[PDB]
């Protein structure tokens, strides 16, 4: 994806903006963004 986009893991084809990480919201399918934050 784009530089400003981080994928929800290698098994997912969806990339979310980096600003969505560690915001208290489970944007990913299983909330991988907030894991180990």
Partner 1 sequence: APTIIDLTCTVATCTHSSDFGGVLTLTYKTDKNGDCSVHSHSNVATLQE
Where on the chain is the footprint of a copy of itself (CB under 8 A)? 1, 7, 10, 26, 30
**How does DSSP classify residue 36?**
T
By the rule CB under 8 A, 17 interacts with partner 1: yes
Q: 23 touches which of a copy of itself, Ca ion, partner 1, none (CB within 5 to 8 A by kind)?
A: Ca ion
Q: 6 touches which of a copy of itself, partner 1, Ca ion, none (CB within 5 to 8 A by kind)?
A: none
By the rule CB under 8 A, 31 interacts with partner 1: no
Asked if 21 contacts 35 with a C-beta cutoff of 8 angstroms, the reply is no
7: left (phi over 0), alpha (psi -120 to 50) or beta: beta
């Amino acid at each position: 994806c784009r530089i400003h986009e981080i994928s929800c893991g290698a098994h997912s084809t969806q990339c979310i903006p980096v600003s969505w990480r560690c915001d208290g919201e489970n944007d990913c399918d299983s909330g991988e963004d907030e894991e180990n934050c």
